């Protein structure tokens, strides 16, 4: 409710602890395979951040999968940048990664990140 006491730092603190759990492989429940690379994560965080992962895990036919093989055309560094963003709220857009990050974000259906990439290319 809008009447309750607001903890303005709570959401970021929760996400920080979720990233800490990922760094220790605690309760991770899926491995994301991107070409020769593998990334372990929590399905709930992937679903919350990505329309692709939401559509995958919300379907009862795929919810229980422990391995997800992404399109092998996806660049592993671009995916790692977006996975870090999911868990940190910080997006590492550089001149050398912007195109890979953007195309990956389109594939992952993260529109907010896609729109932000469109401003990075514009502001360059
Ligand atoms: C106009 N739409 C165009 C297509 N977009 C796909 C999409 C993009 N994201 C990432 C995203 O928007 N954000 C913004 C906030 O910061 C994190 C990343 C998504 C995340 C989820 N995950 C969950 S749990 N959604 C629960 C509600 C829900 C969404 N669709 C539903 C369908 C059926 C039932 C419920 C829902 C699902 C879909 C997307 C959505 C908007």
Structural domains in the chain (count) = 1
Q: Which residues lie below 8 Å from residue 104, measured CB to CB, with a gap of 6+?
A: 74, 75, 78, 79, 81, 82
Expressed in Å, this structure's resolution amounts to: 1.5
Atom of ligand 1 nearest to the CA of 47: 22
Q: How many residues does the chain have?
A: 124
Distance 107 CA to ligand 1 centre (A): 14
To test the ligand 1 pocket, which listed residue (46, 52, 105, 111) has its Cβ within 8 A of the most ligand atoms? 111
117: how many CB neighbours lie within 10 A of its CB?
Answer: 21
Domain that holds residue 124: 1-124
Per-residue CA distances from 78 to 58, 62, 74, 114 (Å): 24, 24, 8, 13
Residue 112 has which token pair?
A: 């907010």
The answer to whether 53 touches 60, Cβ cutoff 8 Å, is no
Q: Which residue matches tokens 């660049």?
A: 75
> How far apart are alpha carbons 124 and 118 in whole angstroms?
10
The answer to whether 47 touches 57, Cβ cutoff 8 Å, is yes
Q: Which residues lie below 8 Å from residue 5, measured CB to CB, with a gap of 6+?
A: none
Tell which residue, 85, 89, 38, 92, has the closest CA to residue 66.
38
CATH of the domain at 76: 3.30.710.10
């Amino acid at each position: 409710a809008d009447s309750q006491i607001q903890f303005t730092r709570h959401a970021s603190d929760v996400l920080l602890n979720l990233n800490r759990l990922r760094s220790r492989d605690i309760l991770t429940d899926v491995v994301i395979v991107v070409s020769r690379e593998q990334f372990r994560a929590h399905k709930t965080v992937l679903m919350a951040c990505s329309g692709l992962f939401y559509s995958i895990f919300t379907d009862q036919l795929k919810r229980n999968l422990s391995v997800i093989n992404l399109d092998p055309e996806i660049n592993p560094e671009g995916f790692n940048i977006l996975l870090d963003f999911m868990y940190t709220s910080r997006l590492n857009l550089r001149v050398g990664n912007i195109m890979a990050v953007m195309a990956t974000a389109m594939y992952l259906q993260m529109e907010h990140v896609v729109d932000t990439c469109r401003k990075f290319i514009k502001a360059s």
